[PDB]
């Protein structure tokens, strides 16, 4: 449906901006009242914060760190509202204080809402997938 | 507002169900088409999965593990849609495989939508707050 197609396009735009180190391209895909929560629990309030932080980290720790889409599971949750759970593979990187982060899958929630016929992101929330934990997911014994 | 009041009540109900080990109460605060992403990136699809997993972990690794609400930052994002970013303090616990997880703050997204006058959660996503990383938050430099 419309929301699924729209959020897929927004996700592609986000990844292009990330991978080409073009953080000046993020603002146009978020509403001003957007929010974000990153992999270490930093909470960004409003688009300007989202963009400032994305820009800062793409200049430093993520300047050579590519992200790769694996799957997008997008759905409409209400008229004018689309939710996606994205699985990506992120390159290894070093934190500002020198900790080596391994190449890993991330699990990213993205939410897009439609206003005046136009879709943009309103929220993102990212978590690193722990590969040591995955086989103990209880839903694997259902059915 | 109305979205923020409705989601505030759902959040209190979620935490009460967690802390009192009453996972049978979760089914009533999620829509059937809900989803969830936990602190280790496990992705649950549909309410039956969300409740099954919450129940399994509350019976085992989280049987004595409380979550304390610190702050709720809730807002309307569309008519009938309310988004909250919740800060909570989670007790230490041991993972199924035997790793010790320390007491920590978590940053939890909760999304509620209204259908026929009733609100329930459609999605949740949780991330552990890394206290070592926090001083690197670029927004502190704006």
Automatic annotation (TrEMBL), chain B:
Domain DUF4440 residues, every copy: 7-120
The name this protein goes by in its record: DUF4440 domain-containing protein
Source organism (scientific name): Caulobacter vibrioides (strain ATCC 19089 / CIP 103742 / CB 15)
Included stretch of the parent chain: 30 to 171 of 174
């Amino acid at each position: 449906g419309e929301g699924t197609d729209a959020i897929q396009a927004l996700i592609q735009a986000y990844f292009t901006a990330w991978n080409t180190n073009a953080p000046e391209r993020f603002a146009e895909i978020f509403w001003p009242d957007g929010s974000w929560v990153n992999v270490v629990g930093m909470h960004w309030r409003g688009r300007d914060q989202i963009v400032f932080a994305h820009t800062a980290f793409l200049k430093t720790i993520f300047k050579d760190c590519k992200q790769e889409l694996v799957t997008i599971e997008a759905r409409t949750i209400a008229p004018g509202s689309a939710l996606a759970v994205v699985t990506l593979i992120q390159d290894a990187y070093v934190t500002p204080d020198g900790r080596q982060m391994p190449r890993a899958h991330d699990r990213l929630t993205l939410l897009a809402v439609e206003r005046e016929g136009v879709w943009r992101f309103i929220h993102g929330h990212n978590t690193i997938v722990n590969p040591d934990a995955a086989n103990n997911d209880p839903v694997l014994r259902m059915k």
